[PDB]
Each structure stands twice: as C-alpha cells, then as structure tokens.
Amino acid sequence: GFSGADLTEICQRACKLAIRESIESEIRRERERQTNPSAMEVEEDDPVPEIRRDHFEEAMRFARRSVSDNDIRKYEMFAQTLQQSRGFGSFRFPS
Amino acid sequence: GFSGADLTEICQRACKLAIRESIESEIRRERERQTNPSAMEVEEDDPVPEIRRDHFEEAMRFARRSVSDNDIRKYEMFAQTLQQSRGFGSFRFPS
Amino acid sequence: GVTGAPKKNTELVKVMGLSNYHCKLLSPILARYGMDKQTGRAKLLRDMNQGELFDCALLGDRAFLIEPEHVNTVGYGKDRSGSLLYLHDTLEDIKRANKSQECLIPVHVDGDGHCLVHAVSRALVGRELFWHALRENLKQHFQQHLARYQALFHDFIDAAEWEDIINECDPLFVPPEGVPLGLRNIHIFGLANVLHRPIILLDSLSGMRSSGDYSATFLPGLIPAEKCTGKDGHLNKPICIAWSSSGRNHYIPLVGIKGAALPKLPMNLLPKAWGVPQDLIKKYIKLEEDGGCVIGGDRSLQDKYLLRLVAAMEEVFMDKHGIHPSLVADVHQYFYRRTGVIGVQPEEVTAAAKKAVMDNRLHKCLLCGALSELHVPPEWLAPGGKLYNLAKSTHGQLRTDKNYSFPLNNLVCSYDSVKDVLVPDYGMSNLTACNWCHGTSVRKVRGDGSIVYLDGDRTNSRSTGGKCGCGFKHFWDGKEYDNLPEAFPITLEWGGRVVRETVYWFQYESDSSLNSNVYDVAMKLVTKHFPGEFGSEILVQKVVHTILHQTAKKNPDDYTPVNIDGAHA
C-alpha cells in the first residue's frame, strides 16, 4: 500500500547507508595507514562503489506508510458517490 | 527530571548565596573594626573566596521541576507513534 | 466449603504438572512415537526405525530415583497404604545392608489391574509413560521366542495357555470373569529379557520363607550377558519390585532416592532365579565382592527431559484426539469420577469429552477450579421431558420459527420439525452457577485448553506485579494485563452527528509496551465511529487534547479501576 512518495524515500535512505559506509571506511583506512606509515601499502581503489544489496535490506526498517487504510476507503467511497448516479447501460435502441 | 534550564538556577541561585555572604561579611567587618580603628591589623584577604558546598545544600531548596510528569507523556507518546508505523523487520531478499 | 473440591486421585495428582492419568493418555502413543532433540516435535518410530513398538531394550539403564521432597506425594512418592507395615521385615535388611540407611522404598502405583508394567515403567522412568510398550512388544517377544519359551515351560505351562499368555499382554483386553486382578510373573521374565536387564521381585521375610515362588529374581535369560550391559561397558543395575499386599493383586516398584546412596540388595533378600539357572545371577547382574548386588543406578534420566516428552506428546494429541489430555483428565474427575466408579477407561473420557468440546458444554469454575458441564439427558428435551413441558404453557405452540430460551437452564432451543426435539445451542448455553460450589464465575473451556475469558475475567496466570492485589493476571481484549484499566467517557461531534463512547485507558503496566498510547486510542475511535469522513484529522486533534487533560492525575498512584462484579468487590 506504499505511496508513490514513500518509494522515493526507500531509494534515498538506502543511499545514506552507502554514503555513510563510504566516508567511514575512507576515514578508517587513513587511520590505519597513518598507524603504519612505513607499511607503504597504497593504490587501494575503493571500498564501496555500489549500492550493494543489504542496504535495502536495512533501509526497509525505516519505511513508513503515508496513507493509512482508513485514508483509502475515504476516497474509494467518494468515487462511488460520483458513480452510482449513473448506469443507464441498459439503454437499447428498439428494432 | 530537571531540564537543561533548571540546572542553571541550581547554579545561579547557588551564587547569589555567595554574593550575599561575601557582600555581608565585608560590611560586617567594616563596622566591626571601628571598635578598634587603631588596631592596624584589619582587611582579611578573603572572607568567602569560593562557592563552597553547603551552598548547593541551600540552593537545592528552591529548585523547581519545570516540566511535570504529566507533560512529558505527550512527547513520549508521539515518538513511539513515529515508531510502530515502521518495522518491516523480517524483510529479506531471496536467496 | 471444605468439600467443594474433591481430593485429587493418585492418577490425577500432578507432580511437576505430570499425573498418572495424563501419562496414561500419552503412553500408548509413545509406543510408536519419539521426542525430537531439535524441534521438540513428536516423531513416529517408523521414520526413526525403532520398530513399530518402542524397544524397551534401551530402557535397561533406566532406574527411577525419587527426590526427598516428592516422597510425601500420594500416588507418586511413598505409598501410604498397608504395604508400609508389610515390607518392614524386608526393610530391616534393606537398610542394614547399606549401613542402616533407607536405600530402597515401595512406590505407589495406580490399581487399574495393569500395575505390573506400570510399576516396571515406574521402575524405569518413574512415570506412567513407557508402560504401554512393555506389554505390546512383550506379546511379540513371546511370539518370537515361544519355541524357546516352550523349551523351558512346555512341561510347566500348558501349550494352550501360551496363546492366553500372549493375550495377557494385550492392552485393553479384559479377561473373562473370575481372573484375579493382576498379571502373572511370566510377563516379568519376558520383561527382564525384553529390558536386557534383571528384575527383582521382593516380598516380606515371611514371603521369602513362604513356599511360593511369587518372589523371585527375573534375569534376562533369553538375552546374553554382553547384551545386558549399558553403553559404558557395565552391566545394568537391576530395577527392583515388590508385592504390595498379602492378596497378591497390586505390584509396586522399588526405587532408590535421587541423590542418595545406591541401594544394595543383601543375599537373603536376593531371591532365587525365576525359570533360569541360579548361576545366571553372576552373569547377568553387576555383582559386588561382598555377596550383594547394586540396585537402582546413576544413569538415570532427569525429570527435565521427561517434561518435554510429555509436552512432546500433547503436541500430536491435539491433532489425533482433538482435545487436551489434561482437559480429558479433569473431565474424568468431574463427570466420570462423579459416579464413584473406579477404573474408568481413559479412551471413553477422551472421545466423549470431545462432544463437550464441540458444543462448548464445559464451564470451568474460576474460583475453586471446578470443571462443570451443562449436561442434559436427551429425553429431557424429547416429548415427556422437563423443558419439553415448559415450552407449551410458557410460549405456546412448538414453533419451528421460534426459539425457546430457558433461563432456568440457560438453554436456547430451536424446534426441529422432523425430530420434534428442542435443540439448544450449547455454545449459546451458559452456566451461571457452578454445580460444585455455585460460583457465579463459571466459564467455557475450548478444545485447545483455552478458557473463554471475558472482559474483567481474572486468569490463573500469575501477575508479576500490580495495584490490583489479586495476584493473578487479568484478561482483556485478547491480551493479558497485570491491572484493570481505568474507564471514563468521551464526547464526539462531527458532521453534526454525536456519539457516546467509553474510553479504557490502561496504565501502570509492568511491561512498558502494553500501556495505552493516546495517538492509537484516539485514532481507533474516530475510525471505529467515522470511517471515511473527510478532514477527520482535525477531529483527532480535538480528541487527543481531551484524553490528556483527563488522564493528568495529580497523584500517580490514583488508581480507580473498572468496577466489575464478581472479579473484585
């Protein structure tokens, strides 16, 4: 029953969880390298280049619903007010 | 249950009980030494140099809880409603 | 009311929740079922290939060990009957052999006529759980070695008797009239061979010097001694049994005390072999250097595992019998034991109580725990019955379109044209006063064992804490709350319409999450009374502001629970 504007949240709160895990490991790598500057170990390309499933498996824990169930049988009941005042489809031209 | 601005009157009303005492012990000393204006041994360096516990013993007597326990409920019953509208939990991608 | 609750019978006394009658409702299914170490679900022995009937040979290491705190229990621990004085002459050398300590004791067993294997099962696990396998497989063990049984007893037992002897192992087969209530020693010989274990049947000092061989040492003669050892390479210490009366009709098991000294049986109290050479005492019993033998053992099963196994059988017993065995047990006590008949079949109580399950005719007392039933004989509603007469002068003609409610019996009866009977929906029938103590709070019991509580009904589950004082949990809206909720009305106006609605506001719950949350209580009402109105979000704000101002109690302990008659007064 998710709205069209709470799938634009699941697809962003699942980016912050890959942004944060990038700066984290980017910083935490410089830490250990400065712990052993003589280690010389360089040319490390990237820790996370990719949204990397098990982000969505975590962003779904903060996924709410905008329109509750009662907020649907409020419009769907208004359609059957504009409707139900119609229905002459029984009309048929004789002969 | 003290706010962030009711700990700033256990820390000022604990100073207006030192200003009082250090501004009284100055005056009382002045009338005192007019009994011996020829003493020439007057002017003690400091009568009260220090906030000096047994002031917080007294300033704690005028400490008022700003937010009553019947008003902190209105918020704790909000944030718990932002939760419980969440938690897709057992969500798990296949395989 | 001193007598408002009948004393619990030996079959009905529940030790750690386990009663003999309850175990009798689970033991026959244990004959082909086992407990699973991972799921805890019962599993057919067909899948784990232990045979169709439970192989009692694995039980040779099983000896019951009684705790001192459970000795005083009637039907579980020490027998209180005259067997206490009976065995004292034997108890004189039982104690003194183990340096004057009580090491071997008689144990009370249900007197339903099959106590022999009941005692042996009580000799093995101390419960009535493994007894049923002891007989059915014994009948097969008799058949497989009947020729070898013939080799010894064809000159002592009639050839036609062996067909009757195997009939003795039949579980519910009632022998013809005149048979003394008790099983012969021939089973124990097979049982000793079946268990891969010696079995010792004792009697008084007079019994040993009596010229009868009814007290003898049953050795596994049909099974070689290397097969009569435990998994540690040691011979299985024998289980001991005794005669419980001078009439020789009830068997008792002799077991040691859990955590105490291992019983040692002196030579004068060690009887001669039964049907096998005397030299087999040395071969089949782990014998000591002093001339005696060790009784009981330390390779025993703790009661913690057996508690799962009983629960592991109540699992399938849901599917197979459509009823709970404890629920059957109470039906036995309150309706079958009500007639005073001793020895009622468990199977009849199981099947018939399902009728009470189907129509919800069980109504359990909430104060003394009595299980009451609204049982009406069929003719009472048929022509000539009591309620049959009332419908005519109180509400006129028997009408197929008119239901007849009988407040005196709380039965609401429709008139079925073909049968000419008034049919009360016993689901709609409600007992209002107990027929044991006349307690007004008597409530239905469902087939799953769940009691049909109502709002304000106090459950038997212990309250972990609460201002109620009742010490029990309370049931509400399908949930169990430690306290009863404060209630006070609310005032709703929307679209010109006005609604009275009463608001129940739980508070002071031991578990935090169960306390009321205004943003759910308010939303529930508006949805419940205004489904699909536009702009109701404004109404909810007005509602919330009211409840908060009403629950703002000056003293947090200002507790004024709901006033429900009967639960609290």
UniProtKB/Swiss-Prot annotation, chains A, B:
It comes from the Eukaryota. It comes from Homo sapiens. Homohexamer. Forms a ring-shaped particle of 12.5 nm diameter, that displays 6-fold radial symmetry. Part of a ternary complex containing STX5A, NSFL1C and VCP. NSFL1C forms a homotrimer that binds to one end of a VCP homohexamer. The complex binds to membranes enriched in phosphatidylethanolamine-containing lipids and promotes Golgi membrane fusion. Binds to a heterodimer of NPLOC4 and UFD1, binding to this heterodimer inhibits Golgi-membrane fusion. Interaction with VCIP135 leads to dissociation of the complex via ATP hydrolysis by VCP. It is linked to Inclusion body myopathy with early-onset Paget disease with or without frontotemporal dementia 1: An autosomal dominant disease characterized by disabling muscle weakness clinically resembling to limb girdle muscular dystrophy, osteolytic bone lesions consistent with Paget disease, and premature frontotemporal dementia. Clinical features show incomplete penetrance. Frontotemporal dementia and/or amyotrophic lateral sclerosis 6: A neurodegenerative disorder characterized by frontotemporal dementia and/or amyotrophic lateral sclerosis in affected individuals. There is high intrafamilial variation. Frontotemporal dementia (FTD) is characterized by frontal and temporal lobe atrophy associated with neuronal loss, gliosis, and dementia. Patients exhibit progressive changes in social, behavioral, and/or language function. It is found in: Cytoplasm, Cytosol; Endoplasmic reticulum; Nucleus; Cytoplasm, Stress granule. Transmembrane segments: none annotated. This is Transitional endoplasmic reticulum ATPase. The chain holds residues 681 to 775 of 806 of the full protein. Residues 28-47 are annotated as: Disordered. Necessary for the fragmentation of Golgi stacks during mitosis and for their reassembly after mitosis. Involved in the formation of the transitional endoplasmic reticulum (tER). The transfer of membranes from the endoplasmic reticulum to the Golgi apparatus occurs via 50-70 nm transition vesicles which derive from part-rough, part-smooth transitional elements of the endoplasmic reticulum (tER). Vesicle budding from the tER is an ATP-dependent process. Phosphorylated by tyrosine kinases in response to T-cell antigen receptor activation. Phosphorylated in mitotic cells. ISGylated. The lineage of its organism: Eukaryota, Metazoa, Chordata, Craniata, Vertebrata. The modification Phosphoserine is found at S22, S90, S95. The modification N6-acetyllysine is found at K74. The PIM (PUB-interaction motif) motif mediates interaction with the PUB domain of RNF31. Belongs to the AAA ATPase family. The gene is VCP.
Curated annotation (Swiss-Prot), chain C:
The modification N6-acetyllysine is found at K304. Residues 104-257 form the OTU domain. It is found in: Nucleus; Cytoplasm; Endoplasmic reticulum; Golgi apparatus, Golgi stack. The active site is at D112, C115, H250. Deubiquitinating enzyme involved in DNA repair and reassembly of the Golgi apparatus and the endoplasmic reticulum following mitosis. Necessary for VCP-mediated reassembly of Golgi stacks after mitosis. Plays a role in VCP-mediated formation of transitional endoplasmic reticulum (tER). Mediates dissociation of the ternary complex containing STX5A, NSFL1C and VCP. Binds VCP and the ternary complex containing STX5A, NSFL1C and VCP. This is Deubiquitinating protein VCPIP1. It comes from Homo sapiens. The chain holds residues 105 to 673 of 1222 of the full protein.
